[PDB]
PDB file with SEQRES, HELIX, SHEET and CRYST1 records, atoms N, CA, C and O in Angstrom:
SEQRES   1 A   16  UNK UNK UNK UNK UNK UNK UNK UNK UNK UNK UNK UNK UNK          
SEQRES   2 A   16  UNK UNK UNK                                                  
SHEET    1 AA1 2 UNK A   3  UNK A   6  0                                        
SHEET    2 AA1 2 UNK A  10  UNK A  13 -1                                        
CRYST1    1.000    1.000    1.000  90.00  90.00  90.00 P 1           1          
ATOM      1  N   UNK A   1      -1.615  15.257 -45.918  1.00  0.00           N  
ATOM      2  CA  UNK A   1      -3.009  15.414 -45.551  1.00  0.00           C  
ATOM      3  C   UNK A   1      -3.910  15.594 -46.757  1.00  0.00           C  
ATOM      4  O   UNK A   1      -3.434  15.859 -47.861  1.00  0.00           O  
ATOM      5  N   UNK A   2      -5.226  15.448 -46.545  1.00  0.00           N  
ATOM      6  CA  UNK A   2      -6.220  15.590 -47.613  1.00  0.00           C  
ATOM      7  C   UNK A   2      -6.358  17.031 -48.089  1.00  0.00           C  
ATOM      8  O   UNK A   2      -5.507  17.873 -47.802  1.00  0.00           O  
ATOM      9  N   UNK A   3      -7.434  17.309 -48.818  1.00  0.00           N  
ATOM     10  CA  UNK A   3      -7.683  18.650 -49.334  1.00  0.00           C  
ATOM     11  C   UNK A   3      -8.755  19.360 -48.510  1.00  0.00           C  
ATOM     12  O   UNK A   3      -9.651  18.722 -47.959  1.00  0.00           O  
ATOM     13  N   UNK A   4      -8.653  20.683 -48.434  1.00  0.00           N  
ATOM     14  CA  UNK A   4      -9.613  21.479 -47.676  1.00  0.00           C  
ATOM     15  C   UNK A   4      -9.934  22.781 -48.406  1.00  0.00           C  
ATOM     16  O   UNK A   4      -9.049  23.417 -48.978  1.00  0.00           O  
ATOM     17  N   UNK A   5     -11.217  23.172 -48.381  1.00  0.00           N  
ATOM     18  CA  UNK A   5     -11.684  24.397 -49.034  1.00  0.00           C  
ATOM     19  C   UNK A   5     -11.187  25.655 -48.332  1.00  0.00           C  
ATOM     20  O   UNK A   5     -11.918  26.277 -47.561  1.00  0.00           O  
ATOM     21  N   UNK A   6      -9.940  26.025 -48.605  1.00  0.00           N  
ATOM     22  CA  UNK A   6      -9.345  27.211 -47.999  1.00  0.00           C  
ATOM     23  C   UNK A   6      -8.289  27.819 -48.916  1.00  0.00           C  
ATOM     24  O   UNK A   6      -8.019  27.295 -49.997  1.00  0.00           O  
ATOM     25  N   UNK A   7      -7.696  28.925 -48.478  1.00  0.00           N  
ATOM     26  CA  UNK A   7      -6.677  29.586 -49.273  1.00  0.00           C  
ATOM     27  C   UNK A   7      -7.267  30.459 -50.362  1.00  0.00           C  
ATOM     28  O   UNK A   7      -8.479  30.667 -50.410  1.00  0.00           O  
ATOM     29  N   UNK A   8      -6.402  30.975 -51.247  1.00  0.00           N  
ATOM     30  CA  UNK A   8      -6.822  31.839 -52.355  1.00  0.00           C  
ATOM     31  C   UNK A   8      -7.606  31.077 -53.418  1.00  0.00           C  
ATOM     32  O   UNK A   8      -8.501  31.630 -54.057  1.00  0.00           O  
ATOM     33  N   UNK A   9      -7.265  29.807 -53.601  1.00  0.00           N  
ATOM     34  CA  UNK A   9      -7.937  28.970 -54.588  1.00  0.00           C  
ATOM     35  C   UNK A   9      -9.117  28.233 -53.963  1.00  0.00           C  
ATOM     36  O   UNK A   9     -10.195  28.160 -54.552  1.00  0.00           O  
ATOM     37  N   UNK A  10      -8.904  27.688 -52.769  1.00  0.00           N  
ATOM     38  CA  UNK A  10      -9.959  26.965 -52.085  1.00  0.00           C  
ATOM     39  C   UNK A  10      -9.628  25.498 -51.896  1.00  0.00           C  
ATOM     40  O   UNK A  10      -8.979  25.121 -50.921  1.00  0.00           O  
ATOM     41  N   UNK A  11     -10.080  24.659 -52.842  1.00  0.00           N  
ATOM     42  CA  UNK A  11      -9.840  23.213 -52.797  1.00  0.00           C  
ATOM     43  C   UNK A  11      -8.377  22.860 -53.044  1.00  0.00           C  
ATOM     44  O   UNK A  11      -7.997  22.496 -54.157  1.00  0.00           O  
ATOM     45  N   UNK A  12      -7.562  22.968 -51.999  1.00  0.00           N  
ATOM     46  CA  UNK A  12      -6.142  22.660 -52.104  1.00  0.00           C  
ATOM     47  C   UNK A  12      -5.779  21.463 -51.231  1.00  0.00           C  
ATOM     48  O   UNK A  12      -6.338  21.280 -50.149  1.00  0.00           O  
ATOM     49  N   UNK A  13      -4.840  20.653 -51.709  1.00  0.00           N  
ATOM     50  CA  UNK A  13      -4.402  19.472 -50.975  1.00  0.00           C  
ATOM     51  C   UNK A  13      -3.010  19.682 -50.387  1.00  0.00           C  
ATOM     52  O   UNK A  13      -2.199  20.424 -50.940  1.00  0.00           O  
ATOM     53  N   UNK A  14      -2.742  19.024 -49.263  1.00  0.00           N  
ATOM     54  CA  UNK A  14      -1.449  19.138 -48.601  1.00  0.00           C  
ATOM     55  C   UNK A  14      -0.672  17.827 -48.683  1.00  0.00           C  
ATOM     56  O   UNK A  14      -1.255  16.762 -48.885  1.00  0.00           O  
ATOM     57  N   UNK A  15       0.656  17.916 -48.523  1.00  0.00           N  
ATOM     58  CA  UNK A  15       1.539  16.747 -48.573  1.00  0.00           C  
ATOM     59  C   UNK A  15       1.357  15.831 -47.367  1.00  0.00           C  
ATOM     60  O   UNK A  15       1.569  14.622 -47.457  1.00  0.00           O  
ATOM     61  N   UNK A  16       0.964  16.417 -46.240  1.00  0.00           N  
ATOM     62  CA  UNK A  16       0.752  15.653 -45.017  1.00  0.00           C  
ATOM     63  C   UNK A  16      -0.607  14.960 -45.035  1.00  0.00           C  
ATOM     64  O   UNK A  16      -0.960  14.267 -44.081  1.00  0.00           O  
TER      65      UNK A  16                                                      
END                                                                             
């Protein structure tokens, strides 16, 4: 998957 503004860092991308 694409990247989304979330998590501890924010702009993170997923493998899906």
